[PDB]
Write a protein that binds this ligand. Structure first.
Ligand code: NAG
Ligand code: NAG
Lengths: 49, 50
């Protein structure tokens, strides 16, 4: 007999909710992988995606 | 010899603590929180929290 402090067991999450931005277009893997004439290593190029 | 001929009555105030505040802690929501991926990992460390 007495008073005791109990932990969480009653409530458990089940539902998965996901929110994502409205970006819809396919991202250009074609013009960066299937291209022609990549530069040499000393003159490498940056591309912002 | 020196002998007093009068007297005075004084009141002295002294203080000292008796008790502090009672506190309690829960390991499962301090160390992890709501993450069940590390509840099982905290279960492997024994009985420190008891
Ligand atoms: C790019 O794709 C075309 C067909 O979509 C293919 O014929 C060509 O060989 C590819 N170029 C590469 C893999 O360098
Ligand atoms: C003793 O001290 C009190 C307080 O100052 C005073 O009222 C009283 O007259 C004194 N006694 C004598 C005999 O002087």
């Amino acid at each position: 007999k007495g008073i005791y402090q109990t932990s969480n067991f009653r409530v458990s999450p089940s539902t998965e909710v996901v929110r994502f931005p409205n970006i819809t277009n396919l991202c250009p893997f074609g013009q960066v992988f299937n291209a022609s004439n990549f530069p040499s290593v000393y003159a490498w190029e940056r591309l912002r995606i | 010899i020196a002998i007093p001929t009068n007297f005075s009555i004084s009141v002295t105030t002294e203080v000292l603590p008796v008790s502090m505040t009672k506190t309690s802690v829960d390991c499962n929501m301090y160390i992890c929180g709501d993450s069940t991926e590390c509840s099982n990992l905290l279960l492997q460390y024994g009985s420190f929290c008891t």
